[PDB]
């Protein structure tokens, strides 16, 4: 029993949604942090093979010229949602000559985060972290499979996200800076990862209002890691 997207519980609830929130927990970790200077973001790849080419695994993809992303858990539901987000932001720029703000992007995604219905398909199994720079400065955003979308100041996802949130609430406050937040994230990273932190494990993605283009750090990330 509970068996099925079309049956409540005697006390609540799904039980399909709950099993999706359960299905989040298996993914790799990621940490995005809002700072008024700009949004930074990090992830762990969990590279298996030396033949596993590291730049081909996507975690941070590019939605807009100033809107980044990160994925979790299931890969291909994320591929679908990334494709649709790209198409629809482009549609907003088409009919409006302007940039669809990040809250409106995520409303456009969570319009069908739950449009799950096989008749009249399954619920999606991915958590997404959205960062971008709207007119209101930088924005950091967190959704879920159930479409219950909320703003977060510094959200951590996936595996080991509890202690990530705890040790994050240890270090975080409102008036942080950029580089301090970068090293504050990667300290938490090499406390929640298992392997030695090096050039190929993690990848950063920072977006600034004056540095809207290139939401990425490429092998100066080596210089950032060796500063710890």
């Amino acid at each position: 029993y509970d068996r099925g997207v079309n049956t409540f519980s005697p006390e609540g609830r799904l039980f399909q949604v709950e099993y999706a929130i359960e299905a989040i927990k298996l993914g790799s970790t990621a940490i995005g942090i809002q700072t008024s200077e700009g949004v930074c973001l990090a992830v762990e790849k969990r590279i298996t093979s030396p033949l596993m080419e590291p730049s081909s695994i996507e975690k941070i993809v590019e939605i807009d010229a100033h809107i980044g992303c990160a994925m979790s858990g299931l890969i291909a539901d994320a591929k679908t949602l990334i494709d649709k987000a790209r198409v629809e932001t482009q549609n907003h720029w088409f009919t409006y000559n302007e940039t669809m703000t990040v809250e409106s992007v995520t409303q456009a995604v969570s319009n069908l985060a739950l449009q799950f219905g096989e008749e009249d398909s399954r619920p999606f199994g991915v958590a997404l972290l959205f960062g971008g720079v709207d007119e209101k400065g930088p924005q950091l955003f967190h959704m879920d499979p159930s479409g219950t979308f909320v703003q977060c100041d510094a959200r951590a996802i996936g595996s080991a996200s509890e202690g990530a949130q705890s040790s994050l609430q240890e270090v975080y406050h409102k008036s942080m800076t950029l580089k301090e937040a970068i090293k504050s994230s990667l300290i938490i990273l090499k406390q929640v990862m298992e392997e030695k932190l090096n050039a190929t494990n993690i990848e950063l993605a920072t977006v600034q209002p004056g540095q809207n283009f290139h939401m990425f750090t490429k092998e100066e990330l080596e210089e950032v890691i060796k500063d710890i």
């Binding site: 068996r3 099925g4 997207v5 399909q16 099993y19 999706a20 359960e22 299905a23 989040i24 927990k25 298996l26 093979s49 030396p50 033949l51 596993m52 080419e53 081909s56 695994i57 890969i75 291909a76 591929k79 679908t80 096989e118 398909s121 399954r122 199994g125």
Partner: protein, 239 residues
């Protein structure tokens, strides 16, 4: 949950049938593929001749374009359908876009088809895993693999089918960055992989290469015989 049907999550957060349709791939014949720097190489094992037929129709290595090559594992009928659809799709890409088809495009198509095939109501998942090897942009060799989930995943060498951990372990314990290719080293690397096969009967070896500008070349099991002989000669030189 239960192992029925494809739409329900587990109580601990899995899809049973995605892990389970990989098992049919995990229980299939082996086929490897590496990239050299200028020549790409792959091949299948287990010709498995039953003494009384032809085998020119059972070929597990085919092509979609003049640039790209195939391989698979698992069951063969899903490979036949996916290859049929892939030819049509590659030609339709050639219809609008006038390029030679990039390998990344056809892998995204196969994985996208595979995932939207898996999402729907009661469509049985394709129990294959393809190897898509090609060199288009400035002749840059690429090879991607698939999965019943639908995850294209770029590598530099690969091993699938039965006992693929040992075979990929051989590519781990061999795989030298030096030098370079050197097509001779790629040929000898195919020879070492096929000698490192699960059986290595010596006659069940079938390999085909592409030098990133030519078309597919099917070899002759005497050149491969002298290859096995010189591999045995280097093995004697180890003593």
């Amino acid at each position: 949950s239960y192992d029925r049907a494809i739409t329900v999550f587990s109580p601990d957060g899995h899809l049973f049938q995605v892990e389970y349709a990989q098992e049919a791939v995990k229980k299939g014949s082996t086929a490897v593929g590496v990239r050299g720097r200028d020549i790409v190489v792959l091949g299948v094992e287990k010709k498995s001749v039953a003494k009384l037929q032809d085998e020119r129709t059972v070929r597990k290595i085919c092509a979609l374009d003049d640039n790209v090559c195939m391989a698979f594992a698992g069951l063969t009928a899903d490979a036949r359908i996916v290859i049929n659809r892939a030819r049509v799709e590659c030609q339709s890409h050639r219809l609008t876009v006038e390029d030679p088809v990039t390998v990344e495009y056809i892998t995204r198509y196969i994985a996208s088809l595979k995932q939207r095939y898996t999402q729907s109501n009661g469509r049985r998942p394709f129990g294959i895993s393809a190897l898509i090897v090609g060199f288009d942009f400035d002749g840059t060799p690429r090879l991607y693999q698939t999965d019943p989930s639908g995850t294209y995943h770029a590598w530099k060498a690969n091993a699938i089918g039965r006992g693929a951990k040992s075979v990929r372990e051989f590519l781990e314990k061999n795989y030298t960055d030096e030098a370079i290719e050197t097509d001779d080293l790629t040929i000898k690397l195919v020879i070492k992989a096929l000698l490192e096969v699960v059986q290595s009967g010596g006659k069940n070896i079938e390999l085909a290469v592409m030098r990133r500008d030519q078309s597919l070349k099917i070899l002759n099991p005497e050149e491969i015989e002298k290859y096995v002989a010189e591999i045995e000669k280097e093995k004697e030189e180890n003593e």
